[PDB]
Design a protein around this nucleic acid. Structure first.
Ligand code: NA
Ligand code: NA
Ligand SMILES: [Zn+2]
Ligand SMILES: [Zn+2]
Ligand SMILES: [Zn+2]
Ligand SMILES: [Zn+2]
Ligand SMILES: [Zn+2]
Ligand SMILES: [Zn+2]
Ligand SMILES: [Zn+2]
Ligand SMILES: [Zn+2]
Ligand SMILES: [Zn+2]
Length: 260
DNA sequence: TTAGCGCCACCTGCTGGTTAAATGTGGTACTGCAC
DNA sequence: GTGCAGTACCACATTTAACCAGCAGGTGGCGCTAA
């Protein structure tokens, strides 16, 4: 039961080899064998093996059910959870199960904690929680475009999407449509079409029970509902101080406020 | 002693489905004015 | 009062990007063995 103990820390190990290796990890901090490619070194030979494999790209073990070959056995074991499911880790609050420990840690941090430090965009004012989400934001909004992208409503050309969106947000209080015969302007195409119809005098809309024609659909609907609906009675608003009748609402107030 | 192996975690990073905020559409009242 | 013309609400349908769980690559720590 742990014959050996580390003098400089609290760890106790059964064998001399295990305690020595623990001393290598935390106390000796030596680098006898490093990689032939870079300056990285390790304590165990298998760590240098997998580092060399990452340098070269060798995948020893292949998945039984899929076409994935892993450089390490633990990678294959974790991959097997894709086919088997079997989410080991469980949240202690919402009791949700997750396949990887990091997934559970991120879930608990971002779903059951209020004050969590967040990342700030180096180029814009947006604030994001996850660094991966920040990378997506940078790669989408802040990416550079060689060919550029013209503004939707002007001849301005931008290379960063964030700049393009910020420019296009300045055109949301503008009447692009302008009549060629007068100074009238509007924001929706239907209004411009109606104005040009009034300019030309065209009345495309026609009543189906009379000879009358209209320049707008709403006008024809109101005429039909008035002069072709026997069971219709107009709304009459009565002054509360004198009693005389008024049809439109605003006129009734115009009389009631000045009535005696 | 010592390399090998197995397990486990930690750290980092990418990626599609989900969803909620933002935004564009169009039906339908709603007034100003000329008659 | 009313019809025409232009405007104003606003419920609704897209649009878009953060949210989030699902994944994989590189490294650090430990417990035994057989070699
Ligand atoms: Na409109
Ligand atoms: Na996924
Ligand atoms: Zn120690
Ligand atoms: Zn190396
Ligand atoms: Zn598989
Ligand atoms: Zn949870
Ligand atoms: Zn940004
Ligand atoms: Zn513009
Ligand atoms: Zn005009
Ligand atoms: Zn009619
Ligand atoms: Zn009155």
């Amino acid at each position: 039961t742990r014959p050996h103990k580390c003098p400089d820390c609290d760890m106790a190990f059964v064998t001399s080899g295990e305690l020595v290796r623990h001393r290598r990890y935390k106390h000796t901090h030596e680098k006898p064998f490093k990689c032939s490619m870079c300056d990285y070194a390790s304590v165990e030979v298998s760590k240098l093996k997998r580092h060399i494999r990452s340098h070269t790209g060798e995948r020893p073990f292949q998945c039984s059910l899929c076409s994935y070959a892993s450089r390490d056995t633990y990678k294959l074991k974790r991959h097997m959870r894709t086919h088997s499911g079997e989410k080991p880790y469980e949240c202690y609050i919402c009791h949700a199960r997750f396949t990887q420990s990091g997934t559970m840690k991120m879930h608990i941090l971002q779903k059951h904690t209020e004050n969590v430090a967040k990342f700030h965009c180096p180029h814009c004012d947006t604030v994001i929680a996850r660094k991966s989400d920040l990378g997506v934001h940078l790669r989408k909004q802040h990416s550079y475009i060689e060919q550029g992208k013209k503004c939707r409503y002007c001849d301005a050309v931008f290379h960063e999407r964030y700049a393009l969106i910020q420019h296009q947000k300045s055109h949301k209080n503008e009447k692009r449509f302008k009549c060629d015969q007068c100074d009238y302007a509007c924001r929706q195409e239907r209004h411009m079409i109606m104005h040009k119809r009034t300019h030309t005098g065209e009345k495309p809309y026609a009543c189906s029970h009379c000879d009358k024609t209209f320049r707008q659909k709403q006008l024809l609907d109101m005429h039909f509902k008035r002069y072709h609906d026997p069971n219709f009675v107009p709304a009459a608003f009565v002054c509360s101080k004198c009693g005389k009748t008024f049809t439109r609402r605003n006129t009734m107030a115009r009389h009631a406020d000045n009535c005696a």
